[PDB]
């Protein structure tokens with residue numbers, strides 16, 4: 001199963017890891033993508049997960065958007081996990097660099113509660129512009145299922161662990 005994680009709470013675990021390398025190693029039931037409403041996996045976690053699937057995630061996502069239209073900010077959809085996981089849960093956290101309501105981060109994390117165990121990044125962190133310390137706090141206060149958080153940046157990982165209440 002998941003190895004090398006630091007236990008933060010009863011159900012939240014954290015590791016300094018590349019979520020792509022982590023997914024290829026574990027091949028979890030669910031890997032969470034830090035998606036946008038259009039499922040355009042250009043950069044950040046989305047660009048990295050999509051590149052690991054040789055663009056199969058983007059091809060599948062474009063067909064999903066053509067049929068269903070865009071997701072809502074705070075919403076999600078379950079698609080294939082390709083070579084990384086059984087499924088990919090594409091979750092849209094608010095992008096504060098696009099003026100989206102940070103209050104939607106709790107709604108975004110509520111999507112994780114539909115899955116018993118997930119490999120995930122911190123929602124709205126990185127290129128989404130939110131404070132990762134706040135994202136971790138919303139994660140532990142919202143997610144009740146088993147969430148294994150992969151934090152790419154060692155210095156951010158240390159700051160998250162050392163400041164965790």
Ligand SMILES: COc1ccc2sc(N)nc2c1
Pocket residue numbers: 017018019020044045048121150151152153
């Ligand atoms: C390989 O690129 C990336 C980019 C962002 C993230 S967040 C995370 N935990 N792992 C990654 C890996």
